[PDB]
Design a binder for this molecule. Structure first.
Ligand SMILES: [Br-]
Ligand SMILES: [Ca+2]
Ligand SMILES: [Ca+2]
Ligand SMILES: [Ca+2]
Length: 294
């Protein structure tokens, strides 16, 4: 529990942009990456469990958290390839070394799994949850939000997201089992208080999801790391959720097939970090300890 952020935000300029992140401690980094429509804040009650286990880092994706907005912004801004271009340069700047443990969720898993494949030699371990593990079909998508997501990927997505901020105000609270506090909702809605383009990142993300073959570039990237992950001996901690949301059904069947993997299930829907922060935190800290004996 806790509405307070973990650590203090530091800033660094990337491709003329300036991105925000948390960088606490020393040693090999334990990289936590949030997805849509959150920020580093999502890991505020989990990162504490890893204290003294390494350099704890949580980056705010471009256009998200305290990171700068891209401008001009529009229907083509914030696609996956653009977020990766900024995340790659941010991770390079932070001098992470070659024994990085990745802790990912949602789009962070898409970005994390991809970076991991491209930089496999540098990856010590991967702890993932409610992730985009492979390209999917609509039938694999959580039914309660299926029509809503098909709507984000239609001309109605602009009104829903840019005008009404649906992903932050409806999706987020809706996929967390416990009632959030006033301060916790403030921290999540802060980067998107302004109607219009400031919220563009939270609409471009659902349009990037590799569902029913589109978009093709993202599908290919996901087909890429899913293939790789299924055969990689890199240690993995799969934090499964009940009832879970995204990583259930076929995708979960698939993830349960990955090598050298430890699994645990915690209570939660999608943004499970809000429902079982300590169960998740404890597990990750244990995972890292076994990966870093001493
Ligand atoms: Br999304
Ligand atoms: Ca070293
Ligand atoms: Ca429908
Ligand atoms: Ca709820």
């Amino acid at each position: 529990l806790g509405a307070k952020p973990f650590g203090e935000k530091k800033f660094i300029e990337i491709k003329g942009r300036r991105m925000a992140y948390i960088d606490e401690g020393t040693g090999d980094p334990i990289l936590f990456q949030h997805g849509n429509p959150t920020s580093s804040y999502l890991w505020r009650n989990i990162m504490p469990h890893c204290a003294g286990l390494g350099r704890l880092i949580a980056c705010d994706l471009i256009g998200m958290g305290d990171s700068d907005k891209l401008d001009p912004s529009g229907p083509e801004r914030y696609a996956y390839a653009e977020h990766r271009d900024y995340l790659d340069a941010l991770w390079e700047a932070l001098d992470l070394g070659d024994r990085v443990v990745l802790v990912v969720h949602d789009w962070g898993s898409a970005l994390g799994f991809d970076w991991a494949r491209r930089h496999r030699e540098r990856v010590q371990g991967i702890a993932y949850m409610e992730a985009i593990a492979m390209p999917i079909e609509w039938a694999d998508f959580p039914e309660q939000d299926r029509d809503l997501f098909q709507a984000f990927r239609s001309q109605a997505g602009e009104e829903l997201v840019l005008q009404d901020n649906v992903f932050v105000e409806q999706v987020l609270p809706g996929l967390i089992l416990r009632p959030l506090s006033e301060a916790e909702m403030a921290a999540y809605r802060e980067p998107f208080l302004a109607a219009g383009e400031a919220r563009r990142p939270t609409l471009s993300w659902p349009r990037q999801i590799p569902i029913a073959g589109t978009p093709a570039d993202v599908v290919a990237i996901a087909r890429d790391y899913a293939g790789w992950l299924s055969e990689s001996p890199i240690p993995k901690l799969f934090i499964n959720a009940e009832p879970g949301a995204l990583t259930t059904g076929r995708m979960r069947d698939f993830c349960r097939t990955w090598p050298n993997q430890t699994e645990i299930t915690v209570a939660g829907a999608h943004f499970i970090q809000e429902d079982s922060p300590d169960e998740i935190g404890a597990a990750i800290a244990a995972f890292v300890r076994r990966l870093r004996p001493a």
